């Protein structure tokens, strides 16, 4: 079992926090919020660094480029923005979705962004131009998550239509189709997809074999698209937020709950795992509005 302990609470957003993500270089944490802002904090000391503003409505997700120099944000204003983190400048506004943009991610090369929207499409955009390369007829209800795999050749998407689909990046073609599916992501090894469904379940899928290998239960997730993670820096865990205001940590192999992290006062909508240290960041909704940083020995 790990032994995560609360280290810091980061206050400052004035509405629900929607997403927290560590920079790939491990130095920063970015947080987005329904307050239309992105804030950047020191990953290790929790020190407030800067606020980044410019979206017209709240933000539901943010993601870092591989070099930790850029951030992309997905907003209710129907756009994504690419930001230079050191200057705080908006470099590009990505326009074309017809409804809220819900989720976003860079590829590993960081020349492409993928986004998912309430308009039920997945779009692939070029970073340097900020223009849309492809719009995929991906789902029949809002798209809850999009993620590239470890070489950027695949995209996984999920939706309130109950489907998870895997796409070929280069062609936009659907390669495989795997309750609303509220979150998906590829594993760090590239071999599995972790999928969350709004029936209080997380499931580990072998996507080559198209089979479910493991189910994780115990938490509450019936209403919100909560992020989950593979934690691989210490022991091999699955980490997720929960609607009972706790962070859950399961053993990836045994499926047992190994720890729950207590302290938030509303739904824990987002958790992120530090790329090299045993550090988790978590964030919560409107009755809480805070980010918590937790540290473990394994």
């Amino acid at each position: 079992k790990p032994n995560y302990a609360l280290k810091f609470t980061l206050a400052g957003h004035t509405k629900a926090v929607s997403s927290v993500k560590f920079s790939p270089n491990g130095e920063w944490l970015a947080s987005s919020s329904a307050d239309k802002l992105i804030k950047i904090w020191g990953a290790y000391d929790g020190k407030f660094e800067k606020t980044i503003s410019g979206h017209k409505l709240g933000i539901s997700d943010v993601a870092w480029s591989s070099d930790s120099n850029l951030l992309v944000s997905a907003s209710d204003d129907k756009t994504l923005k690419i930001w230079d983190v050191s200057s705080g400048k908006c470099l590009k506004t990505l326009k074309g979705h017809s409804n809220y943009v819900f989720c976003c991610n860079f590829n590993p090369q960081s020349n492409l962004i993928v986004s998912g929207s309430f308009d039920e499409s997945v779009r692939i955009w070029d970073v340097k131009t900020g223009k849309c390369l492809k719009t995929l007829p991906a789902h029949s209800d809002p798209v809850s998550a999009v993620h590239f795999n470890r070489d950027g050749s695949l995209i996984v998407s999920s939706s309130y239509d109950g489907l998870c689909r895997i796409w070929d990046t280069a062609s936009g073609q659907c390669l495989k189709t795997l309750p609303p599916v509220s979150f998906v992501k590829f594993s760090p090894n590239g071999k599995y997809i972790l999928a969350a469904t709004l029936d209080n379940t997380l499931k580990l899928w072998d996507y080559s074999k198209g089979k479910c290998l493991k189910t994780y239960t115990g938490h509450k997730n019936e209403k919100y698209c909560i992020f989950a993670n593979f934690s691989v820096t210490g022991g091999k865990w699955i980490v997720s937020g929960s609607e009972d205001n706790l962070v859950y940590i399961w053993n990836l192999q045994t499926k047992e709950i190994v720890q729950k992290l207590q302290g938030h006062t509303d739904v824990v909508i987002s958790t992120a795992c530090h790329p090299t240290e045993n550090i988790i960041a978590s964030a919560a909704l409107e009755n809480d509005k805070t980010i918590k940083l937790w540290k473990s020995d394994c």
Binding site: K15, S18, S19, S33, A34, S60, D61, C225, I269, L285
Partner: peptide
């Protein structure tokens, strides 16, 4: 939207 994610927060609602």
């Amino acid at each position: 939207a994610r927060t609602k």
